[PDB]
Design a protein around this nucleic acid. Structure first.
Ligand SMILES: *[C@@H]1O[C@H](CO)[C@@H](O)[C@H](O)[C@H]1NC(C)=O
Length: 727
DNA sequence: CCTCGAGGG
């Protein structure tokens, strides 16, 4: 009757969630059917032979973050010999972020193991005894600046050969000077990044002929302008032996990032015939990518990262061979100019769909080039310094992001040959301009336009009229004696979504917003309280938006909401958000003025009670959110008439109980009833317990998150800390 | 390998 696994939550697939519960011991709670137990981030510092005896059938166990090394502000975990042996079908185990110095004894059933961020500094053949079914082993971060050790962690030669089935090995951030010797040949991937492996040769990868991904990056770093502690490389560059990767016939992925690579050598990729991913970021290949020939035979290369390579830029002719290339990252390279030659050799690549060009300080750009490519779907030029022509965004659609640039004026010529663009972002520029229908002529196909965080003045009624396919327009956070603000809206014939959120609404703001197409309007963070206080002037401000379905009036300083104003909102309205206003009183029967309303959000107001009316017949209301108010009481039968009521959020209020007289029969059709963060009074007779237990599947966090506000020793603790059914 | 140089897995 009480949920079975207090103080934890039962979740469907045999999962018992005991996360973040301040537990100091493994809970005891039949348990013969639980197969998964998560105990993430509790306070368990000691583990004992008998601690898992009741969970003999566990397959998955997460003990992450129970006894962190430092860490935080220092913990050592003790584990008895037979602790995990009681679970002889245990398949997965996470011991990461625990102060253990040796790996515990484990059952041979184990398949996945994490020992990351512990204090295990030695792995020998004894450490992993009998893990012959192990496929996954992670142990990162046991000897770096956040989890320091003296010297390095040692993996002895052949220590892991017993792991006959090991496909996955990660040993990052462990101060390794060399790749461990005689690693299991079954390895399909090996991560040894961010150690001190300054030298690499075919010897170091001897017999790893089953590798699909190898990460040897960050082993020779340059620590100039490194935010966190960095160990500067002893040499000019990662020393790479030409034949190192030659035998890696199945290598699909290779990352050589942050290796201080000054040149590329085609030898490296010679034997890599299924190489689909290559990461070359954070090196010094600026000149190299401008001239090299290494790319000439990488014909299966799908993804390529060239980001943050330091010293007129032109991608080398070798790029023309990358006919499988789908994605190219060129962030943070820094080139002043983007021209017709800069990216020339990418133009005929059959399936190049994504191009990252962030943070390059580009101040002159012939964007026209992006109309010549074969299948560009996304070009990110955000955070550059583009100021003009050359001399809702999802869209996940030919898309271009020009946000955080230097546009002050938009000129139609900057968009020549970009006529195929369906999504554009000019957000976070400094565009102060009278928009008037003469800015985006070539953008004939533009459906989504983000002009947020700019300084547009929108008095002109011809605004955006040259965008015939415009469906979604974001004018959020816009800062403005002729024309009228927002007058253009009615003339945008296919506009479905519009945001005018957090704007500067001045005297001659159009008293009417009109449309036949707008279905969603975000009018958040404006002054609708101040506007509706000006009498009849704005009484019908939204009425002209025919077919309007969703309206957001959050953060509009609404202190009152008269029936006049609700009645003159479009009768089509299905969703209305009044979140974070100052509503103290509200006749709930006034909701009958919103016939088709289904979702109502009134959170962050000061409705001290649900007392003033009832949910009217025969409303179609489905979701009511009245959280973070100050509700201290509700009238019986309040929710009774809302036939279609499914979700109601009463959380973060001041309810001393939750009574069934409120809902009646509809309490059993409720999919969600959220009553957390109410100061419930947990006397020994309290009736709310049996009620919540009746709809327990439908109240989130009931097991431990629904807590008492009184009496004093129960203050801040769950309604199940003591059994309240006793009295 | 991936997401948002460290962390995840
Ligand atoms: C109820 O509202 C609270 C307000 O903070 C929110 O945290 C929670 O997500 C909501 N509950 C549900 C089930 O959506």
């Amino acid at each position: 009757t009480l949920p079975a696994f207090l103080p934890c939550e039962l979740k469907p697939h045999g999962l018992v969630d005991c996360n973040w519960l301040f537990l100091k011991s493994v809970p005891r709670f039949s348990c013969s059917n639980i197969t998964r137990l998560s105990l993430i981030s509790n306070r368990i510092h000691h583990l004992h032979n008998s601690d898992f005896v009741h969970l003999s059938n566990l397959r998955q166990l997460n003990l992450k973050w129970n006894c962190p090394p430092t860490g935080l502000s220092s913990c050592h975990m003790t584990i008895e010999p037979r602790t995990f042996l009681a679970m002889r079908t245990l398949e997965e185990l996470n011991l990461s972020y625990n102060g253990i110095t040796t790996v515990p004894r484990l059952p041979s059933s184990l398949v996945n193991l994490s020992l990351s961020h512990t204090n295990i500094l030695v792995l020998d053949a004894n450490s992993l005894a009998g893990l012959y079914s192990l496929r996954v082993l992670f142990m990162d971060g046991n000897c770096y600046y956040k989890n320091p050790c003296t010297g390095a962690v040692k993996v002895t030669p052949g220590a892991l050969l017993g792991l006959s089935q090991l496909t996955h090995l990660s040993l990052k951030y462990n101060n390794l000077t060399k790749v461990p010797r005689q690693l299991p040949p079954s390895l399909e991937y090996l991560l040894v990044s961010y150690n001190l492996i300054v030298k690499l040769g075919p010897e170091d990868l001897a017999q790893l002929t089953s590798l699909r991904v190898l990460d040897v990056g960050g082993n020779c770093r340059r620590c100039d302008h490194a935010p966190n502690p960095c160990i500067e490389c002893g040499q000019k560059s990662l020393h790479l032996h030409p034949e190192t990767f030659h035998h890696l016939s199945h290598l699909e992925g290779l990352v050589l990032k942050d290796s201080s690579l000054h040149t590329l050598n085609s030898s490296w990729f010679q034997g890599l015939v299924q190489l689909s991913v290559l990461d070359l970021s954070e090196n010094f290949l600026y000149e190299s990518i401008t001239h090299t020939n290494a790319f000439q035979n990488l014909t299966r290369l799908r993804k390529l990262n060239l980001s943050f390579n330091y010293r007129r830029l032109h991608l080398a002719s070798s790029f023309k061979n990358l006919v499988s290339l789908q994605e190219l990252n060129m962030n943070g390279i820094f080139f002043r100019l983007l021209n017709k030659y800069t990216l020339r050799w990418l133009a005929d690549l059959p399936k190049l769909h994504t191009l990252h060009l962030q943070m390059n300080f580009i101040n002159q750009a012939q964007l026209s080039i992006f109309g010549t490519f074969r299948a560009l779907r996304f070009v990110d030029l955000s955070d550059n310094r583009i100021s003009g022509p050359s001399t809702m965004d999802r869209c996940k659609k030919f898309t271009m992001d020009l946000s955080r640039n230097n546009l002050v004026t938009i000129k139609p010529e900057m968009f020549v040959q970009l006529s195929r663009l369906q999504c554009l972002s000019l957000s976070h520029n400094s565009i102060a301009q009278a928009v008037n229908g003469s800015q985006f002529l070539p953008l004939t196909n533009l459906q989504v336009l983000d002009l947020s965080h700019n300084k547009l003045d929108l008095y002109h009624w011809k605004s955006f009229s040259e965008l015939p396919q415009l469906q979604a327009l974001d004018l959020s956070y816009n800062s403005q004696g002729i024309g009228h603000q927002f007058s253009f809206v009615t003339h945008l014939s296919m506009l479905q979504s519009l945001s005018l959120a957090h704007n500067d609404i001045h005297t001659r703001v159009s008293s009417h917003l009109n449309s036949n197409s707008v279905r969603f309007l975000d009018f958040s963070g404006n002054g609708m309280g101040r506007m509706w206080d000006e009498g009849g002037l704005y009484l019908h401000f939204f009425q002209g938006l025919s077919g309007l379905l969703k309206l957001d009036l959050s953060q509009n300083n609404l202190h009152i909401l008269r029936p006049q104003n609700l009645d003159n909102l479009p009768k089509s309205l299905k969703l209305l958000s009044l979140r974070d206003n100052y509503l103290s009183f509200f006749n709930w029967t006034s909701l009958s003025f919103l016939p088709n309303l289904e979702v109502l959000d009134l959170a962050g107001n000061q409705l001290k009670a649900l007392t003033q009316g009832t949910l009217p017949n025969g409303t179609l209301l489905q979701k009511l959110d009245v959280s973070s108010n100050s509700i201290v009481s509700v009238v019986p039968a309040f929710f009774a008439l809302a036939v279609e009521l499914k979700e109601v959020n009463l959380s973060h209020n001041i309810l001393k109980t939750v009574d069934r007289s409120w809902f009646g029969p509809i309490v059993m059709q409720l999919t969600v009833l959220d009553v957390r963060s109410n100061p419930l009074h947990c006397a020994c007779g309290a009736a709310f317990v049996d009620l919540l237990l009746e709809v327990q599947t439908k109240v989130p966090g009931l097991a431990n998150g629904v807590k008492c506000g009184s009496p004093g020793q129960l203050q801040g603790r769950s309604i199940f800390a003591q059994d309240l059914r006793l009295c």
